[PDB]
Amino acid sequence: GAMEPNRLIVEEAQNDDNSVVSLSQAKMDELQLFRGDTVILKGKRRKETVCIVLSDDTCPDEKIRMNRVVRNNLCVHLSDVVSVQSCPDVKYGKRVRILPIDNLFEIYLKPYFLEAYRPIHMGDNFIVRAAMRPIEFKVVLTDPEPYCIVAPETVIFCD
Amino acid sequence: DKILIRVQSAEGIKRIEISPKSNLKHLYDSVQNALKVDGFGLFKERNFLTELQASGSQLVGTSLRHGDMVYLKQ
Numbered sequence: 159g160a161m162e163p164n165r166l167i168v169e170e171a172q173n174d175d176n177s178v179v180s181l182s183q184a185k186m187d188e189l190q191l192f193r194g195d196t197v198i199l200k201g202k203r204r205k206e207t208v209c210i211v212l213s214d215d216t217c218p219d220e221k222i223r224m225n226r227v228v229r230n231n232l233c234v235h236l237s238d239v240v241s242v243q244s245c246p247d248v249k250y251g252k253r254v255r256i257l258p259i260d261n262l263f264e265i266y267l268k269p270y271f272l273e274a275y276r277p278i279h280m281g282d283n284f285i286v287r288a289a290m291r292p293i294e295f296k297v298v299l300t301d302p303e304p305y306c307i308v309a310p311e312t313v314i315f316c317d
Numbered sequence: 318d319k320i321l322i323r324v325q326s327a328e329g330i331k332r333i334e335i336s337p338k339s340n341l342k343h344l345y346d347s348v349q350n351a352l353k354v355d356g357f358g359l360f361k362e363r364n365f366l367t368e369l370q371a372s373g374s375q376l377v378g379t380s381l382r383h384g385d386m387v388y389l390k391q
Contacts, residue, residue: 192384193384246329248329250327250328309327
């Protein structure tokens with residue numbers, strides 16, 4: 159593995175959730191991360207994104223499991239290396255602007271976010287698989303910046 | 318000796334290190350000193366049903382374990 163405890167080798171997620179990263183409990187014990195912690199991840203090209211960390215009983219200690227959405231936000235591939243750190247200041251979003259890349263609230267964004275307390279980071283792309291067609295969105299703006307929780311009080315501007 | 322209690326608020330997740338043999342009031346006092354808040358309650362769940370009582374003498378360690386998260390309601 160990495161010679162630094164908080165650098166982990168990227169592996170495919172078992173749980174397809176854009177908001178989640180999984181570590182072994184032993185790694186979490188080592189880094190003092192806890193179930194449901196918001197974490198800041200750092201990949202290539204100076205990219206960062208925020209996820210929720212959960213234990214995974216089959217994840218090798220030196221590996222981190224995340225889906226393609228998260229990998230893409232970090233500009234890494236499977237078997238690349240990312241760092242993970244607790245991120246204590248992910249405030250509840252007041253207002254965020256989220257736009258489709260290349261109805262939207264009702265069909266895609268609302269059910270995606272509803273009661274899920276997802277962290278999002280400005281510059282994030284994410285895919286929502288709903289109705290009859292998948293749609294990829296970009297996080298254009300958050301208030302506060304540069305990341306926040308999409309909470310029940312949050313207002314989404316998507317048009 | 319000390320354990321970690323995580324406090325979720327709209328400002329984020331604040332880590333509180335506290336002796337499990339301390340009382341719940343001390344937890345409340347600790348949170349007050351660490352945060353810019355007015356009248357708040359601390360709850361066991363995000364939906365705010367089970368309120369933690371501002372003690373003294375219900376011990377931190379009887380209701381909470383190392384790494385537990387509680388939820389702040391203003």
